[PDB]
């Protein structure tokens, strides 16, 4: 699968989950930031890899870095 | 071999051929046509064109070549407009550098570059005239350069 | 959707009879639009390999008769729109 990794720069502004149109990303309460939040990517089996998250990631440089991995039916986004 | 151009054969062949060829259109008009006077001025601007290329070097092609060695006999060919040119874009470059180190310390450096402050612009446009011994004396203060600016990973 | 596949021949009544008696002479057909066609198909119908591009009343009254005949049968199925 397209392995999404979410590093410790994630200050939890949640433009990533609102920017992902696939709900691979959710927010996890993590007591290491000011908002107490840090994003998680549990459901990367549906991850397209369109990097619409990384556009809307206002950290220093890309707390959430999408690595293009496997290519299944769902991860290739073919309709048929 | 670069012959001196005032005596080369194919040079004067181009003289006869272009004065005659452009002259062929001059017999298409009367003695007081405005075009006929214009081709009088053009024939003048061809004989002057070929007399003012006398001290060049046209080889077997009949076309005036150049020399860029700094032989000091070819200094009016290359090196005098070379030093002249380097003075002119040393002017331009020192104007632009001096204006950017102006607007770097202002209120809003973004609005400074759309709308040029023609007061301070035309200050630096004219003040950057003596950039060798002004840029050089700002180099001896260790200020033309910089250190520890942006870079990638290594 | 085509609930009324009723009649087609009412266009053949409706397009030939409106185009037979108006001759309007000095055109290709000195007779009407259809009389210049039915006479100019019976000369070619008995397996004649002729009828080139210079055969005027076969091709020209082919297309000009089919283009009004198509229009009047289509408008005949529009004659089952008010139901």
């Amino acid at each position: 699968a397209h392995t999404v990794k979410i590093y410790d720069n994630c200050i939890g502004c949640t433009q990533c989950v609102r920017a992902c149109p696939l709900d691979v990303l959710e927010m996890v309460p993590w007591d290491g930031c000011k908002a107490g939040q840090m994003a998680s990517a549990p459901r990367t089996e549906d991850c397209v890899g369109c990097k619409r998250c990384e556009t809307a990631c206002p950290t220093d440089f890309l707390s959430i870095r999408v690595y293009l991995g496997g290519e299944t039916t769902r991860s290739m986004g073919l309709a048929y | 071999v670069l012959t001196p151009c005032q005596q080369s054969e194919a040079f004067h062949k181009r003289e006869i051929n272009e004065v005659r060829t452009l002259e062929n259109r001059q017999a298409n008009y009367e003695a007081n046509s405005p075009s006929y006077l214009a081709l009088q001025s053009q024939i003048d601007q061809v004989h002057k064109r070929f007399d003012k290329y006398g001290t060049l070097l046209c080889g077997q092609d009949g076309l005036p070549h150049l020399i860029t060695d700094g032989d000091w006999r070819h200094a009016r060919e290359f090196t005098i407009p070379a030093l002249l040119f380097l003075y002119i874009t040393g002017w331009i470059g020192w104007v632009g550098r001096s204006y950017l180190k102006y607007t770097k310390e202002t209120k809003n450096p973004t609005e400074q570059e759309i709308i040029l402050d023609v007061p301070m612009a035309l200050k630096y446009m004219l003040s950057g005239f003596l950039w060798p011994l002004s840029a050089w004396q700002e180099y001896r203060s260790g200020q033309l350069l910089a250190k520890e600016d942006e870079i990638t990973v290594s | 959707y085509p609930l009324n596949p009723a009649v087609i021949f009412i266009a053949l009544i409706g397009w030939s009879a409106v185009a037979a008696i108006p001759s309007n002479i000095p055109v290709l057909g000195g007779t009407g639009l259809t009389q210049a066609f039915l006479a100019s198909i019976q000369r070619l119908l008995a397996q004649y390999p002729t009828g080139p591009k210079l055969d005027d009343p076969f091709w020209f009254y082919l297309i000009v008769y089919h283009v009004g005949l198509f229009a009047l049968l289509i408008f005949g199925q529009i004659g089952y729109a008010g139901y």
Binding site: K5, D8, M27, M38, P42, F61, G77 | - | -
Partner: protein, 119 residues
């Protein structure tokens, strides 16, 4: 097709018969009481979730993923609350300790079946 690919049937309810836009295209009838909606892929479905949720209230909505064996799944939400909102049930997976700046060089990963970031 439906006999070999995971059809995505989106089930949701509403209050009034509005009109939304299909991801296949055009306007849809939008049954007011309760309506399911078969689709082709997930981005169509959550793009429709953005299509309706950013306009108005369409909550109690989620696609039941019809995988071709026959049964369903449930993803958005799972704990019942919206994903960018924070619930105390989700376990974070997919992190490392620092930025990319401490990720390993790929000559240290060469001839090994590792990642450029696991360390």
């Amino acid at each position: 097709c439906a006999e070999t690919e995971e059809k995505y049937a989106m089930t949701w309810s509403s209050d009034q018969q509005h009109i939304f836009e299909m991801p296949t295209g055009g306007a849809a009838v939008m049954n007011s009481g309760d309506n399911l909606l078969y689709l082709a892929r997930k981005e169509q479905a959550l793009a429709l979730a953005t299509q309706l949720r950013t306009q108005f209230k369409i909550q109690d909505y989620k696609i039941y993923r019809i995988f071709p064996s026959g049964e369903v799944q449930y993803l958005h939400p799972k704990d019942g609350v919206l994903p960018y909102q924070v619930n105390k049930g989700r376990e974070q997976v997919g992190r490392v300790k620092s930025t990319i700046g401490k990720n390993v060089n790929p000559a240290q990963v060469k001839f090994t079946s590792k990642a450029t970031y696991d360390r």
